[PDB]
């Protein structure tokens, strides 16, 4: 990590991380110190919410590049100004940095008999994510350990699909460990892609479809 940047880590968000990064940090650090908490309070405030859907932000680092301050600060730099200003700036930055949506994914632990494997493979394909991280023969028993991953939005009913398609044989557990949000396929901000109502979204964009339905709920 850059030695200045590492020394300039201000704090983490309600999540990611804030760094100070400009010549004015050297020019007026005392002045700037007076405004840290106002910034600090705001950032948790701003990152806890979001510019697309009022949802929290992941995997993002911010660096203060410039900060102009009112001549003779006659109690001018008030929290009423800077907190929202800072919030706005964050939002703009995210947008111009090319935003994306992230989707949570489960770890799919499936236990089956060997000849029921092909079934399982097809199920994964059908659901959407269709990802199996590993297959391990369970030494000592007529069983396989199947580890996969599955998009939570495509998880509804998944377990019963398994149970029914395998005729009662084998079983599934979904556990959230690692808490990793994978990039949602489509570009975060393109108008064109979506197709009419009641149709599962085409693969190219699941990011654009995701925002609008959430956008409407927000207002």
């Amino acid at each position: 990590w850059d030695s200045l940047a590492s020394r300039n880590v201000w704090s983490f968000y309600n999540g990611n991380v804030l760094i100070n990064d400009t010549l004015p940090d050297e020019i007026s650090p005392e002045l700037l110190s007076k405004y840290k908490e106002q910034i600090i309070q705001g950032f948790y405030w701003a990152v806890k919410e979001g510019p697309l859907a009022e949802e929290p932000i992941y995997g993002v680092q911010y660096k203060l590049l410039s900060i102009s301050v009112p001549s003779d600060v006659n109690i001018d730099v008030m929290k009423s100004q800077i907190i929202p200003l800072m919030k706005k700036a964050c939002y703009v930055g995210l947008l111009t940095a090319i935003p994306i949506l992230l989707e949570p994914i489960y770890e799919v632990d499936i236990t089956v008999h060997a000849p029921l494997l092909p079934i399982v493979e097809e199920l994964m394909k059908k659901r959407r994510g269709s990802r199996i991280y590993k297959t391990i023969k369970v030494a000592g028993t007529p069983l396989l350990e199947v580890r996969g991953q599955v998009p939570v939005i495509e998880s509804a009913g998944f377990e019963t699909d398994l149970r029914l398609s395998t005729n009662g044989l084998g079983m599934c557990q979904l556990y959230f460990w690692h808490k990793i949000w994978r990039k949602v396929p489509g570009d975060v901000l393109d108008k064109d892609a979506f197709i009419p109502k009641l149709k599962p979204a085409p693969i190219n964009s699941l990011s654009r479809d995701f925002v609008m339905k959430t956008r409407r709920r927000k207002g």
Binding site: T160, R163, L164, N167, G168, L169
Partner: protein
């Protein structure tokens, strides 16, 4: 030893007796013995 007596209520067998009986009855009785096969075929699910 085998029976209640004359009346014929109540019965009990030896192991080999049971095993012969079981083996002979196999063609007529075949089921997926595990509770698991009837995931959505039990009474409760029908009621629902």
């Amino acid at each position: 030893k085998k029976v209640n007596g004359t009346s014929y209520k109540k019965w009990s067998f030896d192991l080999p007796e049971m095993s012969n009986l079981y083996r002979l009855s196999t063609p007529l009785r075949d089921e997926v013995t595990d509770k698991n096969y009837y995931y959505l075929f039990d009474k409760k699910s029908f009621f629902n």
